[model samples]
Target: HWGYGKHNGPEHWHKDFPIAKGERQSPVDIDTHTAKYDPSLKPLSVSYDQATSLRILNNGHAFNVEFDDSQDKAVLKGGPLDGTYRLIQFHFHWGSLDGQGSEHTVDKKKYAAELHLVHWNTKYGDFGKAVQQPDGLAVLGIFLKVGSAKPGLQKVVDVLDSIKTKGKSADFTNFDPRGLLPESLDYWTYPGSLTTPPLLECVTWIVLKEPISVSSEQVLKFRKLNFNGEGEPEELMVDNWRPAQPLKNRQIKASFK
Candidate 1:
C-alpha cells in the first residue's frame, strides 16, 4: 500500500500506517543556524569488522548490506545514545538525477544520495524486539555529494549486477562500512522514525554534517537498480527517497559549535 510512487507514496502512507502523521516523523530538514549546539554531546564511537558483513540484496526498496549481528562484532556507542547500539544493516537512497536524493537536508539543500546505517539497542537483545519501543534503534545518516568517485562504493556497486532484480541477493563480505564515512564526526541529533514502512518511531537519528563524495557516473549506477520483483514490469530504482518532513516541536542538537 505504500511506495515512492505518487499513487502510494508518502502522502498516502498515513492511510495505512497512521504513524506517518506522528510528531517525530523522520527525514526532517535541518537548519544549521537554528540548531542548538550542545557542547555535552559525546564523539561517536564506531567499530566494524569487515568479516561481519553477511550479504547484499536488492529488497525492492533499497540495496541493503546485511550484517551478522548475532554477536557484538560491529557496534556504535557514544554520541546522543544512552547505551550501545549494534550495527545490523546499511542501505542507500538516491534520486533520478544529481540535484536531489538525500532524505535529511541542511538549510533545504539536497544531496545526490544518502547512506543509512541502521542499528539496534543491544540492551533490548535484538533488532526485532528493540524496534518495538522508543530508544530501541539508532540510524546514522551520511550525505553523498557529486564529486570524486567513491572507491568504497565500488565494492557494493559491483554486486549490483547480480542483484539487479528484486529479491535477489548475493554473499557480500570483507567490506568495512567505516571507510565510507567522512572524517568529521560532527552531527545533528534528533528523535525520528524509520524512513520506511511500519514507520516505527524508535530511531535516534544521528545525521553527519559532512558529506562523502561520489562521482556522477556512480550516481547514475544507482538508477540501474530495479524496484520490481522478478517477472514484474521493470521500474527504475531511482528517486527512492522520502521528502523532508516537518520538524514540529523537536529540537535539533549539534555535536559541534
Candidate 2:
C-alpha cells in the first residue's frame, strides 16, 4: 500500500501492523554501495513448499489481496524464517524508476522496487499479534530489476487491474510465487523490523542475492495507483517504496551452504 490512504495503506502500517520501532523497517539500502563481506550462508529448505499455493484474499492489510500460503508451508531457521512457521501475505514496495524506490538500499542506493513475502510463526498464533514477539515473523526480500520485459512477474501484474483501487478485491487462486523469486535464492539474513512504521524489530530478514527483472512499463503501472487504490480522487501515489534503515550494529548472515 502506498503511504497516502485512509485505514490500511502504507501510512497506517505502524498503527495497523502495531509494532514498536519505526526505523527498524526494511527495503532500505543493503549492499552499502560496494561488495560487503560475504558471510557463509545456508540453504533454506526449498521444500518448505514446492508449490506456494498463493491466493487472493482481502485481509484489510495494504496487500488487501494476500496469498494463502497453505500449500508450500515453507520453513525458516536461524534467520527470521526460523523454519517454525508458514508464509501468509505477500506485498510490494516500489518506486518510479531504477535510480530509487526499493526498501533495502545498497550503500545509499535504491532499486526500482522490492517484494516482500511475509510469513507468521504458526507456533505463535496470528500474524497481526505474532509480530509482537521477537521471533514471531520472517520476511523474504526479492528485488525488482528495471527492464522492458518483466521476466516472470506477469502473474502479479495481471492481478492489479481488478484491485486497482483501495478496498477492491479479486480472486487469485493457486498462484505460485516461487517463479517470481530470484534464481540464486542465496540470501542475507539478519534481525530487522517491519517495512512499515511501528516498525517492529521482531522480523528476520532474508534478502535474495539475485534480482528478478521487470519492464519499465510495469514500474509505470505501479505508479498509477493511489495509496488508496483506484476509487480515490486524490493524486494517485506513483511511488510507495520506503527508505532503508540502519544496520544497527547488527550483523547479517547468509545461507551459502
Candidate 3:
C-alpha cells in the first residue's frame, strides 16, 4: 500500500497509479494573491444530521469518521457544485510535528493539520460510481491550527485510544461535524483530485479561508495512533499528508473579497 514513507510514499505512487500524475491533482498551493475573486460564487449551503455519524476507524493510513450516507440526510450544496453532495466520511492529515502537515497551503504557509470532509454527488448514485465521473466528488478542506483546545473535537479525540492500532474501530455517533467548521463560509474554489491513490480528478475543492484551533495536546494525541495493525512493528501515524501538486493552468476562484 502507498504510504508517506520512504519507499512507498507520494513520490512513488505514480509507479502504480498513473493518475497520480494527472492534470488536476489535489493538495495544491493556494496563492491567495493570485486567486481571482468571483462575485457570482454563491454561499455554501450545508445540512448535516449528527445522528448520521456512524463509526470511526483506523484504516492504517488515517483515522476516518464514517457517516451513514445511505440517504441524503446530510448534504452539501452551493459554492462550485452543480448538485447536492452527500457526506460520506471525514478524515485528517497531520505531521509528526506541529510546524507542518497540511496538504494545501496558502501563501506558502502550511497549517498544523487539515481535515477533509468527503462527499459524493447524489446525481451519480453512490460514492463508488460517483468517484469515476468528472463532476462526482466535493471535499471540504478545513485547515487546523495548533493553539487553544477545541471542545468540539474532544469527543473525536476521546475515541482515538480505542482505535490507536490500525484496522481498529470504535462506535462513534451523534457527532455534529458542523461544529468543526469556522465562523466564515468564505472560501477558495478549484478543480482537484483525491490526494490519495487512483488520484481521480473529480473533486470540486472548497477550502475554507479561516482555520479552527486545536491544542498542542490534541495534536500529540493524534500522533499516538499507529500506521501498523495489531502485530506489526509500530509505525507512527504521522505525516500522512501528500505534498502540494502543480497548479498547471487551472484558476482558483475566491468566494469573498
Candidate 4:
C-alpha cells in the first residue's frame, strides 16, 4: 500500500502496509566472505509459445505488468523444488541516472538493473491465492550490468516503441517473455522476501549467478520510467530501482552441480 512518491521509493511500502516492513526482504547481501556454497542448480526445461501470458497495467508508477499463470513447459527434473511453476510477472528495478539500482549483490558490488520473474504454485487454486502462502511464490532474479557486451536484450527493447509514453503499453500480442531469459540457467537460490513493498515474506528466491548484458542506451530507456501520471519529463521514471540491502544471515545456495 505504499504510495509511489517522487523522492520516496519502495522503501515506504510499509507506510501503508505496516506488516511489509518485516516481510522477507530481498537484495540481501551475499556474504562471499562467509563461506562458499555449492548447491545444485535446478533443471529448466523451458518451452516456447507464440504468445506469453501478459497483462500490462499503467499502475501510475511504471508500466507494471503481471504475467498471468501460464504453462512453464519446463519441469524441474531435479532441484530444491521439483515441480512445474508457472510464469507470473516480469518487472524491473533501476536507478535514475547516477545511482545504485540493483536487487541481489555479491560481496559489495551493485549492478545497474535487476529483473524479476514471479511464479506461483498452482496447488493454491491460482497465483492470487498462492501468493498469499509463504512458499507459493518463486521469483527469478536476473542482473543487468551496464556495458557494450550486449546481453542480447534487444527482444524486449525492440518493443519499446509500443510503450514509450506513460500509461502506454505496446501490443504485447504474440510476445514471448521467456525469450528474454538468458541462455544460462545457472543460479543461486534461497528463502527470501519480496523486493517490492507489502514486502511479502512468501517467496523463494532463484537468482541467476550469471548476469546479462545491456548497453548504456538500453539502461537509459529503462531509467525513463516516471512514477506518476503527471510529472516533468526530466523527473521521469528513470530511477525505478531500489538499492541493494545487507546480507544479514541469508545463505545463497548455488547450482554448482
Candidate 5:
C-alpha cells in the first residue's frame, strides 16, 4: 500500500503508519555547526568476512544484499553502542537524479545517493525482537556523490540485469561491503526510525561525514531496476529515499571534535 508516489509516499505514510509523526523520525537534516562533539565517543570498529554475503534482491522499494548472520563473522562494535551487533543486510537509496538522492543532508547540502549498512544487536536474538527495542539496531549511512566509479560497487553493478524486476533475487556471495566505507569514521549519531514502512523507531543512526564517489553511469545502472513485479508494467526504481523528517527535540552528536 505504501509507495514513493503522491498518494502513497512519505507524506501519506502517516495515514497507515502513525509512527511517521514520532519525535525521532529518521533522515533529519544534519546541521554541522550545531553538531556537538563528544570526546568520550570511541572509534567505530567494523570487521567483515566477504563470505558472509548470501543473496541480493530487488524488494520493490530498493535493492539489498543480505548477509548470513547465523554467526558473528561479520560484526560491528564500538562507538555509541554498548555491545556487538551482527550484520544482517545492506541497501541503497537514491533519487531520480544526481543531486537529490541522499536521505540525510549535511547543512542542507544533498548528495546523489545513500548507503545503509544495517545491523541488529545480538542481545535481542533476532531482527524481529530487536526491531521492537530502542537500542536494538544500528545503521551506518554513507552519502554517495557523482564522480569516478567506486571499485567496490562494480560487483553489484554486474548483477543488475539479473534482478531488474521487483521480487527478483540472485545468489550474491563473497562480497565484503566494508570496502565501501570512507577513509574516516568521523560521523554524527542520533536516534531515529527506519525511513520505510512500519517506521520502526529502533535505529541508532551513524552518518559518516565523508561522501563516497559513484559514477553517473553506475547510478544509471541502479535506475535500471524495476519497482514493478515481473508480470507488472515496468516502473524504474528511483527516489526510494524518504524525505528529511522534522528534528523535533533530538540532539545530533558528533564523534570528532
Candidate 6:
C-alpha cells in the first residue's frame, strides 16, 4: 500500500513503517573524500547463469527481471559478504528526467537511474528468512548515467511494453546481468537497511565506484510503466528512488584506498 506519491510517499512512510527513522537506513550519500578505504575487503565474485533468469514483471513499485534462485546457479560471494548469496532479482529506480533518479549518490551527485542486484544469504532458509536477519541481504548498486546506449540494458527495455501495467509479467530468460557491470569492480561497502518499506535493517550495501551507461530513450521506456494496476487511474512510475538517509554511526568501507 506504500508508494512514492506525495500523500503515500517517503515523508508519510514513517507513519506506517516506524523503522523509517531507524539508525541503519539505505541509499546514503557517499562522500568520497570522507569515505575510508580498507584492503581487507575481498574482491567480489559473481557467477550468473543466463538460463537462471526466469521472467520480467511489474510489481507496482518497479519492474524486475526475476531469477530462478532455487539454487546457487546465480550466486555472489566474497567482497563484504560472509559467504555465498543467491541473486533473487534485479530492478531499477529512476526519476522523470535525466538529472535525478539514483538512490545512492557519489559526492552528492545523482545519476539518471540506479540498478539494484538483490541477493540473499544461502545459509538462510530462503529470501523470506534472510531478509529479516541483520546479515541476510546484500545489494550491488550500479549508478546509471546518461550516455551511449547500453545494449545489455536495452534487452530489459525491449520488453517494457509487454508489462506496462502493475502485476503484469512475461516469460524472460537467457538474460545475463554480468554484462551490465562496469569494467571495474571497485566499490564502497556499508551496513544499511532496505530503502523501501518495511525498511528492514538487514542489507549490506555495495555501491560501485564506477557507473554504467544507458541511453535516454531506453530510460524513457521505464516512465511508461504504470504504478497503477489495470482499471485504476494511470500514474507513471518515475522518481521511485528514496532520498539519501542519515549515515549515523555506520562506517563506510572502501575496497580501494
Question: Please, what is the TM-score per model?
Answer: 0.98, 0.79, 0.98, 0.82, 0.98, 0.98
What are the lDDT figures for the candidates, one per model? 0.91, 0.63, 0.93, 0.63, 0.91, 0.92
Indicate the residue-level lDDT of 113 in model 6: 94
The candidate maximizing lDDT is 3
Off by over 4 Å in 6: none
Q: For model 5, how does the per-residue alpha-carbon lDDT over 1-257 read when each residue is reduced to its tens digit?
A: 89998778999999999999998999899998999999988889888864389999999899999999988898888998889899899999998988799999999988999999999999999989999999999999999999989999999999999999988899998998977888888999999999898998999999999989988889999998988999888889999889899999999999997
* Model 1 C-alpha lDDT per residue in residues 1-257, reported as the tens digit of each score: 57799898888899889999899999999999999899999888887763288899998888999999988888888999999999999999999988999999999999989999999999998999999988999999999999988888988877788998889999998888877899898899999999989899999999999999988888777889999988999999988899998889999999997
Q: Could you tell me which 10 consecutive residues in candidate 2 have the lowest summed lDDT?
A: 56-65
Model 2: per-residue Cα lDDT over 124-233, one tens digit each: 76777788887788888887878656645677677666665666666666666666776687777777877666667778778877778888877776676554534446
Per-residue CA lDDT of model 6 for 103-197, tens digit only, reads: 99998999999999999999997999999899999999999998898988878999999999999999998898988998888999999999999
Candidate 2 accuracy as TM-score: 0.79
Q: Can you give the lDDT of residue 2 in candidate 3? A: 86
lDDT score, candidate 5, position 59: 90
Better of 1 and 3 by lDDT: 3
Per-prediction CA RMSD (Å): 1.0, 4.1, 0.9, 3.2, 1.0, 1.0
Worst 10 residues of 1 by lDDT: 43-52
lDDT of 3 by residue, 103-144 (tens): 999998999999999999998889999999878999999999
Q: What is the lDDT of residue 15 in candidate 1?
A: 86
- Which 10 consecutive positions of candidate 6 have the poorest summed lDDT? 43-52
Off by over 4 Å in 3: none
